[PDB]
Tab-separated table of C-alpha atoms in Angstrom:
chain	number	residue	atom	x	y	z
A	1	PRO	CA	11.247	-13.043	-10.800
A	2	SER	CA	14.940	-11.719	-10.758
A	3	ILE	CA	16.255	-10.097	-7.408
A	4	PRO	CA	17.258	-6.258	-8.254
A	5	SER	CA	21.069	-6.011	-8.236
A	6	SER	CA	21.189	-2.636	-7.318
A	7	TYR	CA	18.820	-0.025	-5.520
A	8	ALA	CA	17.249	2.179	-7.901
A	9	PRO	CA	16.363	6.027	-5.932
A	10	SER	CA	14.373	6.907	-9.530
A	11	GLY	CA	13.385	4.903	-12.522
A	12	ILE	CA	9.677	3.378	-14.157
A	13	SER	CA	8.153	0.133	-14.032
A	14	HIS	CA	5.067	-1.634	-15.978
A	15	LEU	CA	3.089	-2.697	-13.148
A	16	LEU	CA	2.235	-5.912	-14.593
A	17	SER	CA	1.313	-7.295	-11.417
A	18	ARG	CA	-1.811	-4.749	-11.035
A	19	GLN	CA	-4.859	-4.327	-13.086
A	20	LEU	CA	-7.802	-1.694	-14.084
A	21	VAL	CA	-11.088	-2.128	-13.275
A	22	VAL	CA	-13.796	0.494	-14.896
A	23	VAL	CA	-16.950	1.107	-12.729
A	24	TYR	CA	-19.495	3.681	-14.273
A	25	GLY	CA	-23.827	4.171	-13.626
A	26	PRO	CA	-25.976	6.168	-12.455
A	27	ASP	CA	-25.466	5.226	-8.804
A	28	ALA	CA	-21.514	4.425	-9.282
A	29	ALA	CA	-20.326	6.785	-7.107
A	30	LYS	CA	-22.932	6.247	-3.992
A	31	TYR	CA	-22.383	2.625	-4.039
A	32	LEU	CA	-18.354	3.292	-4.472
A	33	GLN	CA	-19.049	5.374	-0.995
A	34	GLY	CA	-20.453	2.217	0.546
A	35	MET	CA	-17.834	-0.034	-0.526
A	36	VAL	CA	-14.596	1.480	-0.004
A	37	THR	CA	-12.711	3.066	2.914
A	38	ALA	CA	-11.893	6.490	0.839
A	39	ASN	CA	-14.113	9.699	0.860
A	40	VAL	CA	-15.454	9.380	-2.793
A	41	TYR	CA	-17.338	12.776	-2.749
A	42	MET	CA	-14.681	16.163	-2.044
A	43	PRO	CA	-14.493	17.623	1.443
A	44	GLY	CA	-17.528	20.370	2.517
A	45	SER	CA	-19.842	18.350	-0.018
A	46	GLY	CA	-21.542	15.432	-0.172
A	47	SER	CA	-22.696	15.418	-3.610
A	48	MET	CA	-20.021	16.191	-5.187
A	49	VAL	CA	-17.514	13.253	-6.476
A	50	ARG	CA	-13.879	13.971	-5.991
A	51	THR	CA	-11.941	15.149	-9.228
A	52	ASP	CA	-8.425	14.041	-7.741
A	53	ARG	CA	-6.385	12.058	-10.845
A	54	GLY	CA	-6.094	9.084	-8.397
A	55	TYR	CA	-6.179	8.810	-4.175
A	56	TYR	CA	-5.779	5.165	-2.251
A	57	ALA	CA	-8.487	2.993	-0.644
A	58	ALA	CA	-9.170	-0.578	0.944
A	59	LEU	CA	-12.295	-2.337	0.359
A	60	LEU	CA	-12.459	-4.011	3.702
A	61	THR	CA	-14.531	-6.927	4.781
A	62	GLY	CA	-17.874	-6.436	7.493
A	63	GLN	CA	-15.036	-7.837	9.391
A	64	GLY	CA	-13.013	-4.761	8.458
A	65	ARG	CA	-9.794	-6.833	7.292
A	66	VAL	CA	-8.580	-6.463	4.286
A	67	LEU	CA	-10.237	-7.449	1.008
A	68	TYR	CA	-8.126	-5.616	-1.556
A	69	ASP	CA	-6.095	-2.199	-2.011
A	70	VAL	CA	-6.583	-0.400	-4.667
A	71	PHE	CA	-6.031	3.041	-6.439
A	72	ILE	CA	-9.517	4.794	-7.409
A	73	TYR	CA	-9.093	7.295	-10.477
A	74	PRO	CA	-12.432	9.444	-11.432
A	75	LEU	CA	-12.541	8.787	-14.775
A	76	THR	CA	-14.582	11.749	-16.574
A	77	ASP	CA	-12.239	13.219	-19.647
A	78	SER	CA	-13.736	11.191	-22.706
A	79	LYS	CA	-12.086	8.470	-22.396
A	80	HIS	CA	-12.397	5.351	-25.502
A	81	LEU	CA	-12.471	2.771	-22.971
A	82	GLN	CA	-16.016	3.247	-22.396
A	83	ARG	CA	-16.360	2.453	-26.716
A	84	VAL	CA	-19.750	4.220	-26.762
A	85	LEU	CA	-21.536	5.888	-23.796
A	86	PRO	CA	-23.345	3.856	-22.131
A	87	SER	CA	-24.084	6.495	-18.756
A	88	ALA	CA	-22.232	9.794	-19.070
A	89	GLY	CA	-23.753	9.163	-13.455
A	90	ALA	CA	-20.098	8.958	-13.243
A	91	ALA	CA	-17.038	6.539	-13.805
A	92	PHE	CA	-14.137	4.799	-11.568
A	93	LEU	CA	-11.129	2.738	-11.952
A	94	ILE	CA	-10.112	0.799	-9.762
A	95	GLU	CA	-6.168	-0.582	-9.474
A	96	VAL	CA	-6.322	-3.494	-8.080
A	97	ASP	CA	-4.246	-6.509	-8.075
A	98	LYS	CA	-3.649	-8.444	-11.535
A	99	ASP	CA	-4.940	-11.447	-9.984
A	100	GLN	CA	-7.615	-10.175	-7.851
A	101	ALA	CA	-9.335	-8.427	-11.161
A	102	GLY	CA	-11.932	-10.584	-11.570
A	103	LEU	CA	-12.615	-12.092	-8.230
A	104	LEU	CA	-13.543	-7.866	-7.810
A	105	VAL	CA	-15.549	-7.299	-10.835
A	106	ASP	CA	-17.361	-10.530	-9.316
A	107	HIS	CA	-17.399	-8.860	-5.641
A	108	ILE	CA	-19.322	-5.406	-7.165
A	109	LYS	CA	-21.323	-7.185	-9.274
A	110	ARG	CA	-22.972	-9.566	-6.708
A	111	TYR	CA	-23.407	-7.185	-4.259
A	112	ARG	CA	-25.492	-4.186	-5.744
A	113	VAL	CA	-28.757	-5.106	-5.880
A	114	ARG	CA	-30.632	-2.403	-7.200
A	115	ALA	CA	-27.291	0.305	-7.820
A	116	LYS	CA	-27.558	1.064	-10.802
A	117	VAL	CA	-24.158	0.091	-11.360
A	118	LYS	CA	-21.802	-1.482	-14.415
A	119	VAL	CA	-18.873	-3.676	-13.718
A	120	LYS	CA	-16.164	-4.780	-15.811
A	121	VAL	CA	-11.944	-6.092	-16.165
A	122	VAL	CA	-9.900	-3.521	-19.007
A	123	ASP	CA	-7.580	-5.224	-20.124
A	124	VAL	CA	-3.851	-4.342	-20.003
A	125	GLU	CA	-3.733	-3.703	-23.719
A	126	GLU	CA	-6.414	-0.592	-22.995
A	127	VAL	CA	-4.942	0.962	-19.937
A	128	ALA	CA	-1.827	-0.229	-18.179
A	129	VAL	CA	-0.742	0.417	-15.295
A	130	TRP	CA	2.543	2.406	-14.349
A	131	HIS	CA	4.940	3.451	-11.569
A	132	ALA	CA	7.641	5.889	-11.585
A	133	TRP	CA	10.066	7.395	-8.246
A	134	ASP	CA	12.324	10.198	-8.238
A	135	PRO	CA	14.113	11.990	-4.998
A	136	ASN	CA	13.180	15.807	-7.343
A	137	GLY	CA	9.738	14.489	-7.853
A	138	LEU	CA	7.170	14.149	-10.405
A	139	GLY	CA	2.915	14.198	-10.669
A	140	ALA	CA	-0.364	15.596	-14.914
A	141	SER	CA	-3.314	14.631	-17.336
A	142	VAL	CA	-1.609	15.250	-20.438
A	143	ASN	CA	-3.004	12.863	-23.542
A	144	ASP	CA	-2.232	9.722	-23.173
A	145	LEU	CA	-0.848	10.012	-20.049
A	146	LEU	CA	-3.010	10.175	-16.217
A	147	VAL	CA	0.223	10.853	-13.730
A	148	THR	CA	-1.219	11.203	-10.399
A	149	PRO	CA	1.565	11.496	-7.252
A	150	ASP	CA	1.606	8.287	-4.804
A	151	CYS	CA	-0.265	9.837	-1.364
A	152	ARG	CA	1.124	6.608	0.583
A	153	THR	CA	4.636	8.640	1.769
A	154	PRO	CA	5.622	11.502	1.016
A	155	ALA	CA	8.533	9.532	-1.361
A	156	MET	CA	6.218	7.089	-2.796
A	157	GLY	CA	6.407	9.184	-6.560
A	158	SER	CA	2.963	8.883	-9.116
A	159	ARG	CA	1.366	6.428	-10.348
A	160	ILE	CA	0.878	6.712	-14.111
A	161	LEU	CA	-1.924	5.081	-16.189
A	162	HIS	CA	-1.029	4.620	-20.531
A	163	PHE	CA	-3.998	4.752	-22.109
A	164	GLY	CA	-2.827	4.959	-25.518
A	165	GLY	CA	-1.542	0.865	-25.923
A	166	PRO	CA	1.097	-1.265	-26.256
A	167	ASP	CA	2.639	-0.098	-29.168
A	168	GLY	CA	3.003	3.315	-28.493
A	169	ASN	CA	5.943	6.173	-27.263
A	170	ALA	CA	4.516	7.977	-24.510
A	171	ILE	CA	5.803	5.902	-21.546
A	172	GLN	CA	9.798	6.088	-23.427
A	173	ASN	CA	8.887	10.207	-24.199
A	174	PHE	CA	8.082	10.295	-20.137
A	175	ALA	CA	10.690	8.045	-18.855
A	176	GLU	CA	13.220	10.220	-21.313
A	177	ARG	CA	11.192	13.489	-20.497
A	178	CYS	CA	12.454	13.292	-16.743
A	179	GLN	CA	15.679	11.275	-17.013
A	180	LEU	CA	14.026	7.890	-15.516
A	181	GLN	CA	15.738	3.926	-16.606
A	182	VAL	CA	12.502	1.991	-17.431
A	183	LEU	CA	13.303	-0.653	-15.018
A	184	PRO	CA	11.063	-3.680	-14.072
A	185	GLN	CA	8.454	-4.963	-11.772
A	186	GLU	CA	10.987	-5.836	-8.947
A	187	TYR	CA	12.914	-2.553	-8.985
A	188	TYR	CA	9.559	-0.804	-7.608
A	189	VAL	CA	8.599	-3.291	-5.326
A	190	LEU	CA	12.431	-2.800	-3.912
A	191	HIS	CA	11.484	0.772	-3.556
A	192	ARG	CA	7.853	-0.087	-2.300
A	193	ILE	CA	9.837	-1.893	0.518
A	194	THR	CA	12.381	0.674	1.109
A	195	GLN	CA	8.948	3.329	1.504
A	196	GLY	CA	7.503	0.400	3.694
A	197	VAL	CA	3.863	0.105	1.042
A	198	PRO	CA	2.678	-3.422	1.424
A	199	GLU	CA	0.654	-3.597	-1.975
A	200	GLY	CA	-0.984	-7.242	-3.514
A	201	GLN	CA	-2.958	-9.783	-1.445
A	202	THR	CA	0.397	-11.478	-1.370
A	203	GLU	CA	0.662	-8.953	1.300
A	204	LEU	CA	-2.101	-7.974	2.835
A	205	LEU	CA	-3.995	-11.057	3.121
A	206	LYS	CA	-7.298	-10.931	1.826
A	207	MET	CA	-9.834	-10.912	3.712
A	208	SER	CA	-7.181	-11.609	7.037
A	209	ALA	CA	-5.306	-8.321	6.730
A	210	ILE	CA	-5.363	-6.442	9.794
A	211	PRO	CA	-6.185	-2.542	8.995
A	212	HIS	CA	-4.092	-0.303	11.676
A	213	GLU	CA	-1.752	-3.767	11.066
A	214	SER	CA	-1.043	-2.516	7.174
A	215	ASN	CA	-0.472	1.178	7.458
A	216	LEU	CA	-4.062	1.966	5.855
A	217	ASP	CA	-4.504	4.730	8.742
A	218	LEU	CA	-0.740	6.030	8.126
A	219	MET	CA	-0.693	5.868	4.812
A	220	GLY	CA	-3.635	8.036	3.437
A	221	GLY	CA	-6.016	5.225	2.386
A	222	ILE	CA	-8.863	5.839	5.238
A	223	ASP	CA	-10.878	8.755	6.015
A	224	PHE	CA	-12.545	8.550	9.606
A	225	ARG	CA	-14.840	11.354	9.420
A	226	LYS	CA	-17.169	9.679	6.303
A	227	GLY	CA	-20.212	7.723	6.679
A	228	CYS	CA	-20.414	3.932	6.410
A	229	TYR	CA	-19.790	1.669	4.790
A	230	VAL	CA	-18.219	-1.709	4.672
A	231	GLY	CA	-16.242	-2.851	7.676
A	232	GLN	CA	-16.239	0.848	9.053
A	233	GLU	CA	-17.234	-0.145	12.627
A	234	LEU	CA	-13.691	-1.949	13.413
A	235	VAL	CA	-11.608	0.282	11.709
A	236	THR	CA	-13.265	2.867	13.534
A	237	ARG	CA	-13.239	0.953	17.220
A	238	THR	CA	-9.837	0.738	16.616
A	239	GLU	CA	-8.973	3.910	15.917
A	240	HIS	CA	-10.981	5.519	19.028
A	241	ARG	CA	-9.942	2.470	21.577
A	242	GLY	CA	-7.112	0.520	20.628
A	243	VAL	CA	-4.266	0.443	21.079
A	244	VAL	CA	-1.979	-0.486	17.985
A	245	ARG	CA	1.258	-2.844	18.939
A	246	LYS	CA	1.525	-3.956	15.760
A	247	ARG	CA	2.522	-2.384	12.197
A	248	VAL	CA	4.012	-3.004	8.455
A	249	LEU	CA	7.180	-2.087	9.118
A	250	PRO	CA	10.550	-2.281	6.587
A	251	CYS	CA	13.238	-4.747	7.910
A	252	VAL	CA	16.861	-5.009	6.713
A	253	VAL	CA	18.055	-8.894	6.686
A	254	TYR	CA	22.045	-9.458	8.380
A	255	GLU	CA	24.343	-11.074	9.519
A	256	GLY	CA	25.505	-10.687	13.176
A	257	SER	CA	27.577	-7.313	12.770
A	258	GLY	CA	15.666	5.929	0.972
A	259	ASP	CA	17.616	5.936	3.629
A	260	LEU	CA	16.524	1.817	4.190
A	261	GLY	CA	17.757	1.391	0.316
A	262	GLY	CA	21.542	2.488	0.752
A	263	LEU	CA	21.535	-0.648	2.628
A	264	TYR	CA	20.089	-2.961	0.057
A	265	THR	CA	22.556	-5.893	-1.599
A	266	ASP	CA	21.262	-8.827	-3.508
A	267	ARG	CA	24.099	-10.967	-1.941
A	268	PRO	CA	22.941	-14.258	0.371
A	269	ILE	CA	22.761	-13.757	3.805
A	270	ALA	CA	22.596	-16.801	4.835
A	271	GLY	CA	20.059	-17.918	2.494
A	272	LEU	CA	19.918	-16.819	-1.340
A	273	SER	CA	17.815	-13.938	-0.995
A	274	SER	CA	14.330	-11.902	1.813
A	275	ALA	CA	12.281	-14.220	-0.551
A	276	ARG	CA	12.607	-17.728	0.517
A	277	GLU	CA	11.566	-16.974	4.030
A	278	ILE	CA	8.219	-18.953	3.984
A	279	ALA	CA	5.961	-17.029	1.091
A	280	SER	CA	4.056	-15.092	4.168
A	281	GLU	CA	3.743	-15.238	7.896
A	282	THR	CA	7.132	-16.225	8.897
A	283	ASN	CA	7.641	-15.858	12.844
A	284	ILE	CA	10.494	-13.710	13.749
A	285	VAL	CA	12.286	-14.449	17.028
A	286	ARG	CA	14.334	-12.810	19.490
A	287	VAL	CA	17.272	-14.446	19.420
A	288	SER	CA	17.751	-15.153	22.903
A	289	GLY	CA	14.727	-17.657	23.040
A	290	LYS	CA	12.263	-15.942	25.297
A	291	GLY	CA	8.932	-15.406	24.582
A	292	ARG	CA	8.509	-16.248	20.963
A	293	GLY	CA	6.771	-14.764	18.121
A	294	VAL	CA	7.872	-10.523	17.622
A	295	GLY	CA	6.917	-10.563	14.225
A	296	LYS	CA	4.910	-12.275	11.212
A	297	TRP	CA	7.187	-11.574	7.345
A	298	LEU	CA	5.118	-10.803	4.806
A	299	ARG	CA	7.646	-10.074	1.557
A	300	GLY	CA	11.286	-9.648	0.909
A	301	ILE	CA	13.858	-9.213	-1.862
A	302	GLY	CA	17.588	-9.078	-1.574
A	303	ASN	CA	18.275	-8.379	2.590
A	304	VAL	CA	15.223	-6.229	2.737
A	305	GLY	CA	11.222	-6.861	3.392
A	306	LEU	CA	7.969	-6.371	4.776
A	307	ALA	CA	6.970	-7.405	8.230
A	308	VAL	CA	4.434	-6.975	10.885
A	309	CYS	CA	6.419	-5.982	13.342
A	310	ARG	CA	5.815	-5.770	17.396
A	311	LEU	CA	6.411	-1.869	17.464
A	312	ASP	CA	7.036	-2.296	21.673
A	313	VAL	CA	10.117	-4.971	21.509
A	314	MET	CA	11.539	-4.465	17.719
A	315	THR	CA	11.510	-0.594	17.402
A	316	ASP	CA	12.068	2.820	18.777
A	317	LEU	CA	8.220	3.994	18.677
A	318	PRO	CA	5.888	5.970	20.573
A	319	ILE	CA	2.976	3.910	20.499
A	320	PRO	CA	0.026	5.413	21.064
A	321	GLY	CA	-2.162	4.839	23.704
A	322	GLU	CA	0.162	2.583	26.107
A	323	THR	CA	3.313	4.948	25.917
A	324	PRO	CA	3.551	7.628	28.648
A	325	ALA	CA	4.446	11.252	28.000
A	326	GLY	CA	8.271	12.434	29.431
A	327	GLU	CA	8.310	15.745	32.253
A	328	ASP	CA	8.230	17.925	28.530
A	329	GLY	CA	5.058	16.460	27.438
A	330	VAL	CA	7.228	14.000	24.505
A	331	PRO	CA	6.543	10.100	24.820
A	332	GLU	CA	9.209	8.249	26.128
A	333	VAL	CA	11.948	6.239	23.893
A	334	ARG	CA	12.515	2.625	24.815
A	335	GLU	CA	15.746	1.590	23.741
A	336	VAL	CA	15.284	-1.565	21.407
A	337	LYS	CA	16.832	-4.941	23.133
A	338	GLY	CA	18.842	-8.043	22.139
A	339	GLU	CA	18.614	-9.189	18.795
A	340	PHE	CA	16.300	-11.385	16.471
A	341	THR	CA	15.345	-13.993	13.806
A	342	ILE	CA	13.085	-16.194	11.785
A	343	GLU	CA	11.454	-19.251	14.200
A	344	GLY	CA	14.013	-21.803	14.158
A	345	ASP	CA	17.442	-20.740	12.754
A	346	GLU	CA	19.844	-21.089	15.347
A	347	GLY	CA	21.973	-19.692	12.361
A	348	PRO	CA	23.634	-15.949	12.267
A	349	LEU	CA	20.600	-14.318	10.413
A	350	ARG	CA	19.184	-11.192	11.811
A	351	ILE	CA	16.463	-8.919	11.649
A	352	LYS	CA	16.184	-5.337	12.112
A	353	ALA	CA	12.778	-3.174	11.384
A	354	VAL	CA	13.799	-0.287	10.559
A	355	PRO	CA	10.817	1.949	11.109
A	356	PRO	CA	10.511	4.543	8.180
A	357	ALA	CA	10.901	8.994	8.603
A	358	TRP	CA	7.481	9.352	7.765
A	359	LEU	CA	5.748	7.006	9.818
A	360	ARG	CA	7.600	7.962	13.075
A	361	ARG	CA	6.776	11.866	12.812
A	362	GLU	CA	2.394	10.021	11.724
A	363	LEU	CA	3.054	7.701	14.720
A	364	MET	CA	4.284	10.639	16.881
A	365	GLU	CA	0.999	12.494	15.599
A	366	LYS	CA	-1.479	10.457	16.699
A	367	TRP	CA	0.308	9.997	19.805
A	368	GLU	CA	-0.387	13.806	20.492
A	369	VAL	CA	-3.970	13.047	19.439
A	370	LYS	CA	-4.498	10.034	22.173
A	371	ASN	CA	-2.775	11.969	24.642
A	372	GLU	CA	-4.926	14.805	24.219
C-alpha cells in the first residue's frame, strides 16, 4: 500500500502476499519431483528426500512457462499442522502467492490421477511466512520458527516460517535478538527489487513468464541434472541451445542527470512513483526514438523496479553464446549507447538497468561454460 520512505538494509517482514500449501502422502515426493523444477531428492540418491529446511523452485506449464514460483519446505518434525496423522510417506510445505494458493491446490489435485497425494491450504494463522534480511546474515529450526536461507541471491536473507500462531512472541523475540526492525511487506519488496529478484504472479506472469528471462537458472531454482518434469524440455533446450538476450534486472527511474538501495528515494520523478508505470509490460524504449522496444516493465516502488531488459542494449553484461572473447579469453565489454525511457513519454524520465553483482558474476560463469 504505502511507499517506503527510505531503503532498509536490514529488517523482517510478515509476507502477507505469500501463503503455504501442504502436500503429503505416500507419493508426495515422487509426485512433486515430476512437477517442480528443483530436485526433491538429495544428490547422489534417487530416493532420499532433501532435508534442507527450504529451497527455491518453480512449477512450469507443459510449454515451459512459469506457473508458480515457490519455496519448498520439507516437513518432518512433528508439526501439528497435520492435527492427527494420515501419513507418517513425506510431507511438504509449498509457499506460493496468496492469491494463487487455492489455484495451486486445485492444480495439484487434478493432475495426481493415481498418486497417493493429499493437498490443502494452510491457514495463515496456523503457519505464517516471514522474511528477514541483514548484511551480517542469519540462518534455524527452533521450537516455533523455521529459519532457512533464501539462496536466490547471496544477500536475499532468510525465509522464516512461524508455526505458533498470531498471538505469539516468537517473531518479536527473533527480531529483538537479531536487532531487526519489524517492517511492513513493502520494505521486503524494496529489498527484493534491489537484489533483482522477481516474485509472485504479478511479476512472473502466470503461464507466460519465461524461466531464463526470469533468472530461474541463476537463482538456483532449476536443477538441470535432474530427470523429467513438466516443462523440462523447453527449459533444457534454452539452457543448451538458446541465447538468452532478455533477463529480469533491477532498474532506476531518474531525471536527466545493497548498492541499488543507496539510490532509492520515495520522491517523484515525473510520475508519483514507480508503482504507477502500467501495472505490467510497459515498453522501455531508446530516448532517440529508434527501434522501439528494448525492455518490459514488471513492477516498481519509489524510483526502482524490475524489468525484463534486453541485455545487449541496456547493459554491459556478457551474453553466453553470443559475446565474443577477447585476446585474454574474457568476453569483450561493449558500452551502453544512449539512455532509455518509457514508451510514449517525451519528458525527462529515464530508466537505467543496474545489473546486480551476483548476476554479473554468474553470467560470467555461464559465458565461460558456453565458450568452452
